[PDB]
Design a protein around this ligand. Structure first.
Ligand code: HEM
Ligand code: HEM
Ligand code: HEM
Ligand code: HEM
Lengths: 141, 146, 141, 146
């Protein structure tokens, strides 16, 4: 459900993120673990302390996956097909948790790119994120 | 829904530096743009065609300020949220017929905006405080529903 | 996000509905107007009385649109592109109302095909309905 | 959240014919199948691989019965839902950490099931009553959250 100009907005917005994707996914995660504690449930084996090298580590995992989807918007089901199986078949994550991480991710970007985070870029990124949230939670097997 | 003694002190300490007229005007505009179906409740405001028409609209800057003022009246009376929003509840429920999921939205956008404005001082810990001091207002507003 | 076996379930489930689609959309509507009054808002020009020939009329409109989408699951964005513009661009219906009509629609089917409404058919129809709810509320223009 | 005098009489009049053991066991199974992510809270129940394993599972039939019994305790004390679910609230919130949107789901499935069972006697009007007498239970359960 991504329009033509949503795509352009996305591709361009993510180029401004550049190489901090990793950094951002790590901070976006930390914000979620403090604001929505119900999520520390899917991470019992992790060290959720503030300077956790495990979170920084996972954050990277997350940021990279996104940059991956940005380069394949015309077929997100084809490029995330494995992450979809992990989060929907194996982990069985509640889809409501996806709206939360997306929200915390958007809160991070506002803090770091206050001048590029224009209302129009906000509308596109929110939709792009929703597409990704839909794919990852669909058991099409 | 009290947060804590140390937390709370920091919550009111931020609201002092909050610039009403602008913070609230960008929060409403952000909502009309991102979730375009809420535009339906403000047709009498005029032209909301695109993000440029909406941000520069006077009625939106005006109304946005009042909504922001209303939050402040909550950021202070954290102990009496269900009596401080008693009337508003009645307006948004049986009168306007607004769905409660929207109270949610405006709440988070208000936060995404506070982030863009205060930068690195809006620490993940502070954001956590605001996340409840926002969720409580969202709930008070849905109380006098049934 | 419709799997392979969800499609088959749907096509087959809707063949059992047969020619009562019209009838069902009418009753599914009536159930919504009584259980979720907030919806009488999008219908001020209608006669919402119990035997309303306006609702029976619209019901048909709705049932037919569905049978239409059942025959084009492999491209719902292509076949409902006009209904998507009417409900998202012109009417600006709140998406939460879609979950309600879908729920009332599923309640109708249970009442009329208690023996075909197997749990597996329930899971597929719910998803199929959600796909349709997503399309109709997406402004890809 | 009182419905009415005439309504209420019809609501309790249906619950008499409600067969606990079966109604509740199909409602839980229906939830585990349709929204498969809730399966995560019941791993100790064993095999939930497919709809056949789930419907025939004993723990599910058992637990389903208790949840149904809990509703009945609500269908009667409609006046004290927030004190009748006071403890359960505490169990599902701070202990289990269940999201409140699920209380919603189970509620509607409980209804889709009551429809399949009573057929044409489950009139749209009756369904309307149950729709609130369900939403209230869903809200009581989320109260002692914060
Ligand atoms: C945009 C959203 C998300 C993306 C891009 C994403 C991406 C990823 C990636 C790349 C991995 C696997 C990396 C590897 O193979 O080592 C992963 C693992 C995981 N994700 Fe997600 N995820 C997302 C949201 C979530 C959400 C909402 C939750 C739940 C709160 C979640 C819970 C997990 C868990 C528990 C793991 C496994 C950790 C481990 O055992 O090492 N993810 N995610
Ligand atoms: C949840 C947070 C919200 C708060 C704190 C809030 C607060 C207010 C306040 C303070 C007023 C002014 C009352 C007066 O001037 O007497 C108002 C009016 C109104 N609100 Fe909200 N509101 C919220 C969300 C919403 C949402 C999401 C909608 C959109 C569907 C909505 C639609 C309206 C409308 C249309 C009016 C009438 C404005 C007028 O003509 O004066 N509100 N709200
Ligand atoms: C599966 C869901 C839905 C389908 C298949 C659907 C289908 C339709 C169709 C076919 C029409 C236009 C027919 C024509 O051109 O005369 C229509 C009109 C309309 N729909 Fe829906 N609709 C759906 C859900 C909803 C919902 C959730 C609402 C809001 C509660 C809604 C509100 C309307 C309104 C107000 C009209 C215009 C009535 C008029 O002025 O004649 N629809 N819908
Ligand atoms: C909203 C309606 C619900 C009601 C009325 C309800 C009621 C109950 C009741 C009566 C118990 C038994 C307490 C005891 O035996 O001491 C229970 C336990 C539990 N509930 Fe719920 N529940 C509801 C929804 C949920 C949902 C949606 C989840 C799924 C995430 C959930 C997960 C559990 C779990 C795992 C237990 C523990 C069972 C055990 O080990 O004994 N409940 N619930």
């Amino acid at each position: 459900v991504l329009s033509a100009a949503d795509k352009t907005n996305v591709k361009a917005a993510w180029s401004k993120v550049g190489g901090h994707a990793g950094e951002y996914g790590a901070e976006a995660l930390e914000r979620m673990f403090l604001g929505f504690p119900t999520t520390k449930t899917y991470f019992p084996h992790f060290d959720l302390s503030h300077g956790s090298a495990q979170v920084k580590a996972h954050g990277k995992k997350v940021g990279d996956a996104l940059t991956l989807a940005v380069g394949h918007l015309d077929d997100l089901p084809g490029a995330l097909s494995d992450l979809s199986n992990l989060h929907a078949h194996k982990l069985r994550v509640d889809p409501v948790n996806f709206k939360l991480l997306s929200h915390c991710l958007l809160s991070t970007l506002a803090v770091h790119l206050p001048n590029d985070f224009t209302p129009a870029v906000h509308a596109s990124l929110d939709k792009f994120l929703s597409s990704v949230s839909t794919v990852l939670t669909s058991k099409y097997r | 829904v009290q947060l804590s003694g140390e937390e709370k002190a920091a919550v009111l300490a931020l609201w002092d530096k909050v610039n009403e007229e602008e913070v609230g005007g960008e929060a409403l505009g952000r909502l009309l743009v991102v979730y375009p179906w809420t535009q339906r409740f403000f047709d009498s405001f005029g032209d909301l065609s695109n993000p440029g028409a909406v941000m520069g609209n006077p009625k939106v800057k005006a109304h946005g300020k009042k909504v922001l003022h209303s939050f402040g009246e909550g950021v202070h009376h954290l102990d009496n949220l269900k009596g401080t929003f008693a009337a508003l509840s009645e307006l948004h429920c049986d009168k306007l017929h607004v769905d409660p999921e929207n109270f949610r939205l405006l709440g988070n956008v208000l936060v995404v905006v506070l982030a863009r404005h205060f930068g690195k001082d809006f620490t993940p810990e502070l954001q956590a405080s605001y996340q409840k001091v926002v969720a409580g207002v969202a709930n008070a507003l849905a109380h006098k529903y049934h």
